[PDB]
Each structure stands twice: as structure tokens, then as C-alpha cells.
Amino acid sequence: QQTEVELRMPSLLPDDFIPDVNTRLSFYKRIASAKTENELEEIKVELIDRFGLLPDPARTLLDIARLRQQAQKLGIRKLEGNEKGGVIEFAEKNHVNPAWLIGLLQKQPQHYRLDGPTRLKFIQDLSERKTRIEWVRQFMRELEENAI
Amino acid sequence: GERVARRRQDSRRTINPDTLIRNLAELHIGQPVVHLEHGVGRYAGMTTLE
Amino acid sequence: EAILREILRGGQVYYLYNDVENIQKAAERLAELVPEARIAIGHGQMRERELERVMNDFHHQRFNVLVCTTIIETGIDIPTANTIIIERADHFGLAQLHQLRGRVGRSHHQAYAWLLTPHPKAMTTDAQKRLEAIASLEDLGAGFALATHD
Amino acid sequence: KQVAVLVPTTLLAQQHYDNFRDRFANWPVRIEMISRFRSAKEQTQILAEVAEGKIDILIGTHKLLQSDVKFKDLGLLIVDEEHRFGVRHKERIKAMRANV
Amino acid sequence: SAAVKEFFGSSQLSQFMDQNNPLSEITHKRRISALGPGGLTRERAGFEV
Amino acid sequence: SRARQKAAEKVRDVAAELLDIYAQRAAKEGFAFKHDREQYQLFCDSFPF
Amino acid sequence: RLVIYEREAPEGTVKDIKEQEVYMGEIPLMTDNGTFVINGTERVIVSQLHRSPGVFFDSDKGKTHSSGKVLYNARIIPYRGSWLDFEFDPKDNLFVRID
DNA sequence: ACCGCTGCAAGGAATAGGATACTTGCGGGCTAGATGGCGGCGAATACCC
DNA sequence: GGGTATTCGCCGCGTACCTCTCCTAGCCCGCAAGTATCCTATTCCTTGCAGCGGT
RNA sequence: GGAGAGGUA
């Protein structure tokens, strides 16, 4: 069920955050089985209540789960990324506006190139994990508003 | 049957354009040079070595 | 002497070098040291339709010595091969050394195993402790005591 | 129950293929090897046969863990020479089929 | 650096300078020691050397 | 290519993955194979030792 | 100057040859006088007086075997190598030993 | 004008090369931690009867 | 047997005082070797088509 | 606390 939003950055629950293994595993199940951003907010508040501050791996895990939550509804089956760019692997029937997609492709041909039927390559200097995260967030947010 | 050993070389003659210059050897000192194994350097003349 | 002792008996030799960059020179040099032997090279970094055919020829006795990497550490049987010669055995684990020693035998013959080393002041200390342990246990069934020592 | 034999090198893959094909040479059991020694056009044929459920013993190297090798009804795994694999390689198949 | 600093710093012949005269310095730089590495012992030397 | 760097910090956690794999293998019950006596004795007779 | 010989060509042929100025060790400098500042303390390395390599004919003057006889020997002491000792037995025999 | 031949061209199959993940070892950095004594003497051989 | 002789290894080698320098090894990480895989260019090989010649 | 060097009687 994980339409992976792997960005080659650590997204997990660190051992110092939650010491015992079983509570970590229970929260992994709870996060990856949650289907609404309201439920992810509930999990986040429960994490903050029972363990305090959320480290960078924990916040990356939660925002990756949120990105997957939006991507499962939209229709991106494998949104990927790295330091040099990334590949959007769509579904058989995605919900991207075609005229808008061609508009993006013609306004930035160096940052959007279709390589295959459902693979769109973007090339971006995503040197920072955070900046990559809001780049993906705004990309997908501008996608979902034009979804048909 | 016998050995099907035909892997002597691959055609590396591709991508040879004006850059190669057909090895005229008229380079002047300080002219930048690419050596595809190592990278970009500055040519500094002909020398003799043992 | 080891290679001639195996050739005159009719068996085959593993000669493990474990360095692909210089294996073509090690085999060419060994083919001058012992001209009576027929020598091939087998490692996992040459093309598939060549390694497969070399290791097929080795089964059918088309050559005696096969200068190999540790791709033969894994359990290749070849019952006629009864002499392994590990060229520089100081940097190998106990498990790897015993596995390499296990490739000879496999039949009613008596099989030797030479672990050539550098000058013993040039080895490290862990290499000395590993070699004095692999040479300490030479018995049938010593693969479990060696494991519970490792 | 579609035995799956996992060996940590291609020479072991080939030798175990030969030994298994020698032993099961009088039974209606189909034995097949998948590794880099097989081509790129017959590897997909082997995967199609296995997923269909017609190869009953599939001897392979680390190729047997690459998430595109789907067994129909896997009932036995045989990890041979396990001291060259690592933990992730040893539960990469145990995770998919839990009770193998 | 180890084999050079070990000889210069702490050896039997790389020794602390006597510096209470100009004479003491200029004659300590000109000693001819029969001891040290590759040489005889301070307390196992006979009557002849 | 920045090999010197120690990358990130455990890009993944293996304690939870291995614990869940073990606790799912130890939770349910595997296949109970049915053994044939005289159909396996032929396979034993194929062994030349 | 690290040479590289290529594998395909016959024995002795230079594929590449690289060169760089490598830093290896800091060596102490003698001052204007003869003194070394090693850790902030001026030290002096004293000249030694040792046995020169070569050949040395010697004898033990009637102080062995209680015979009252002198036993002449001859050492060959190389700068780098194994020494070679000849010596006389108490029966006027000539005997050789190494190390 | 109709058929055989050849050069060319496209299309997929090998093939290289880089990137990633296992095993093993080993060194570097930073921090817990062998050949210049000599006398005396009693015991251990080496030997000869 | 069993006494003599040669050799070998331990034990020993002055008292008191003053000044100075110099005293680190082991374990974790990142490199190397091997092995395996995927992924992406890049060359290579085979077969089918357009143009030209023989009849 | 120990090694190395030098010194006084």
C-alpha cells in the first residue's frame, strides 16, 4: 500500500525518541495504516504528549505519510526523489490536467521531461531535506488543485 | 564448439568531432586539455622521462 | 612441487589468487613457473559466456590448474580437484579459510592444502592468530569447533 | 509446494542446478535456474513460469530477492551457504511468505 | 615522523644541553660518547676502553 | 563523490522490521506436509550411496 | 612519480605516469649553533664512537679452557648482513660460524 | 518490365560501466589504558673407559 | 655402570644527594578485495527494405 | 610510580 515517496532521507522513529521496540512498531503500524490527515494529526499529538519533541526523522516520517496520503487519492503510484531530481511514476488512470501538464512542460522543459508512458523526470538541486519536502508539497498541492 | 571469443575492442571512435582536431599536435602551452580518464587539465609542453 | 605432485597423480589444482586486476599476470607467471600444467583463469568479473565455459572445461579435465578468485569459496564440488594453493592467505577469515580448505578432498584420495603467507614478521597479529588456528584444526568434523571458535 | 533454493553465487547456482536436475531425473518435477548467466529474455520467461506455477524448484542467486520474483504457492525455502548473505537477505523472502 | 621524533626527542644520545656557560654549550656539542645504541654499556665496560 | 562522509543516521531501523517479521512468523501456523512412505522410498533408492 | 604499466601491452610499457609533491614527515632543523629545539628545550645530539664495520682479528689472552693458551679469532662484521666468525679450537683446529 | 542482388538501415541483444548491498580484512585517528661483560659455581650433559 | 671433562645457565657487581625529559593501545569507521543485483548508455549483430543490374 | 641522560662527594 506504500506508494513510496522515498526521498533518500531518513524517515523513521529513532531509538532515543522511543526506547522500547514494540511501541515503535505499534506507531509504525498506526501511521502507515492511517488514512486521513486528521488521524495523522492525532498520532502526532499522541507522540508529542507521550514523548515530547519530535526529531527530524520522526517529522520526516510523518510528512512522508501525509504525502503518501495525498498521492494515493491523486493517483501518483511512485513519487521518488534524490539530490539531483526525481521520477514521478503515475497510475494507469491518473488525474493530472493534460493541458496544464503540457503548459508546465513548455514553460520548464529543463525541469519536466516525460520518459516513458507514466514516468516524468524532474531535475532539481534538492540539497536540503526540508527544502525538498516543501518542494514536493507545493508540487503536489499545485497538482491536486487542477485534478480532474 | 570452439571459443566464441569476439570481445577484442569496442568502437570508441564515436564522439570524435572538431575537439579531437585530428591530433595536429600544434597545441600551445597553457591551452586546456580534456583527458577522458582523469578530467580537465592545462597542457604544459613535451618532456622526456625515464 | 605441489602442482607437480598433483599433476602426476592425475588430479587438478585450485590456485587461488583473489585479485582480478593481477590475475592475468599471476596465471601467466605460474604458466612459466610450471610449464607442465595447463592453466585457465576463472573469476566472477569476466563475461558470463566465458566464465561458464571455463568452469565447464574444468569439470571435463581440459586443464589442471585454475587460477581463481574466492568465487570457489562457496562450495563447488569438483571431486577430482585435490590440492588448493592459497597465494596470500594472511587476509582471509577463519570461515573463508576453512571453506577454501573444504574444496579439496570430496573423494577417496588424500588432498593437501597450502596456505602461502608472506614473511611472518610482515603479517599482522590477527593473521597469525587466524593461521595458527586454521592449522591447529585439521580433522574431519572440525567445521563446528572452528565455528564455535570464530 | 515450489521449493526455492538460494545460493550466494552463480557457480553454486549452476552446480546445484546440475545436481538437482540429475537427482530429479525420473519424476515430473521441473527445475530451473535464474541468475545473470540466464539471458534477459529467458529470465522473464522463468519469472512468468514461476508466477504461473509451473516451475517447482527455482535455484537462484540474490535475484530471488528482487521483488519481481513472485512465487505462486511457496512452501519451502533452502538457503545454502548462509554465511555470505546478511540478515536483510535472509528475511527478504521470509517477510513476503510469513510461514515458509 | 615517529621514527625521527623518537630519535630526536627521547634517545640515549639526543640529550639535554648543559647551558650555564658559553664554554659548557660549546664543549657539550663536541663530546664523543662511547655509549648509546650500538655501543658498550656504562657499567659493563672494562679497564681498557 | 564525497565518500568521506558517513551519510545519514541509520536510513532505516532494523529492530522493528526484524521484530515484526519474527512475530509474524511465530504467530500463525505453517503448512503441515503430508509424507508418503513408499513414494519417498523410491527417491531414497535413487541415491547411489 | 607513480608509473602505471598497462596490462595488455608486453612487459614494460607506460599507460600513465602521475607526479605530485607529497609531504612525508617533519624533520627537526639544527639551529645556527648545533642545537635542536625539540619541545621548547634546546637539546644536543652527541657524536658516538662505535665499532667500525670491517674485519677484526682479536684473541682472548689465555682466559678460557684453563689451558693457558691464546685462542685467536677473526670476525667479519658487515654494515648490513650476517657476521662471519673464524676461531681457533683449543686443539689448534679452525672453526667457522655465522651469527 | 519482372526478378535477383547488394548496400543500408533499423531493431533488439549483448556488453560496458556506474551505483548499491552482503561477507572478510586492515590501517588511521581519537580517545578510554638478536649479535661490546666477566668470574664463580654447581648442575647438566658429552665422552671415554 | 661410572668417573672425568666440557659446557651452560644463574647470581653478583658501592652509598648518599641534585637537575632535566619522557612515559598509549584499542576500537570504530572508512578504505580495499571478493560476490551478487539493477540501471543506463553504447556497441554489435541479424534481418528486412529500397535502389540497381541481368534477362 | 618507572626508564633515559647528566652532575656533586
UniProtKB/Swiss-Prot annotation, chain E:
Function: DNA-dependent RNA polymerase catalyzes the transcription of DNA into RNA using the four ribonucleoside triphosphates as substrates.
Assembly and interaction partners: The RNAP catalytic core consists of 2 alpha, 1 beta, 1 beta' and 1 omega subunit. When a sigma factor is associated with the core the holoenzyme is formed, which can initiate transcription.
Organism domain of life: Bacteria
Annotated protein name in UniProt: DNA-directed RNA polymerase subunit beta
Family affiliation: Belongs to the RNA polymerase beta chain family.
Organism (species): Escherichia coli O157:H7
Gene name of this polypeptide: rpoB
Portion of the full sequence shown: 499 to 547 of 1342
